[PDB]
Amino acid sequence: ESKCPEELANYCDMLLRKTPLSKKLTSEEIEAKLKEVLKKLKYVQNKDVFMRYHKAHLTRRLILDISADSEIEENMVEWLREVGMPADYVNKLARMFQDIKVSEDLNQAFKEMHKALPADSVNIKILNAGAWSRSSEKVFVSLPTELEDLIPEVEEFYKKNHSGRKLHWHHLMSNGIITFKNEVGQYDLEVTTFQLAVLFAWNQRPREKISFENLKLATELPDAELRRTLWSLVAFPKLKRQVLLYEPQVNSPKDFTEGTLFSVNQEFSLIKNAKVQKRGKINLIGRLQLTTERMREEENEGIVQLRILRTQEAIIQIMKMRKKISNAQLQTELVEILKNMFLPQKKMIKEQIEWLIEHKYIRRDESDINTFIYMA
């Protein structure tokens, strides 16, 4: 049935995105196997965890424009509103679909408004900041001249369109394809800005080793991100030949050190039928809401589960000792049993009483709407 508020979110992504499961089916089945899930959400602790992991997923699909069913993705929205999902959430996602359209029209336009890089080498995408983006923490990176010179040029293009607006560049979500002349051949690499930054930090010293400390200076990427990004380039999963050959091996990015040395693997190349391809193209993406963010909500979401758990337990504890208690009397001593745990808030309480009423733990009296009875 699937219980995890997250695994649930991960299934919708599996269905809406170009994966095996979604190509091995048809719009009817899919629409069906989707309709099924939103129904089960009515039975999930805090629906927000599902919203969080869902929006995130959409963003990935929307941006990398790898949505399998462009029709549903939209439609997915209303069924998402229909089931009951919050207000500001639904239309907010909707606003996201509206931007890719507003953007296509805006890209097609920008490209023509000029006949840095070749016309169709650059593709823009301007999205609402309140809708999309979440955690806003300055993230710094050194852009190679090519990209840097484009930013302002696009910045002015939007200017004579909708004044009173300012673009804020999103390097996490931006991506592109870069060539990679190796010693075995030339290949196309699909990457995020951060990676472009790390790789390009070799251009002026093609065959030189660069330590972790220097990359921190050449790329500006804060320590953490650098670690992930490098790891993403020395250990990309399901990849036969890696792009960057690091030095003292480790099993985790956390183990990297100032002295750690990195170099452009000259023996890189794809393979097709145990035959070494000289021309190839691979993808190295799938990024997120800056790492520090991940640790943020988790840290809290865990605490919430714990309060919920304690609240839940504390109720049935009073309920066990006494047997027939009133909302009134229960509210007050609910605060004392959790005296050395935390002060339960009345919303959390209300919700767990409901939760305990359907899972048949507590029952309301016919004689008194309030006043609960400890059942079974």
Binding site: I124, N128, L150, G164, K166, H170, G176, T179, R207
Partner: protein
Amino acid sequence: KRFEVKKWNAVALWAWDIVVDNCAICRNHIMDLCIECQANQASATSEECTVAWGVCNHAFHFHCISRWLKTRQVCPLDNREWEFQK
């Protein structure tokens, strides 16, 4: 052993810039409410109060110009007929 950009997908976030001049019409911060929305109660007319931009590049509130079109149909500053911009 170059690494050269071959295709770039730039992504930026749309955000309302900060304007620091005043509405030459009601004489209030363009970013705040107008003299109307300020006092006049809530209602079906208490609709959002945005700013407007014209082909003359000046920018007054939205209501403070509306009440300036049922009549004088030129921009009070550069006397060149009013014309909006999206």
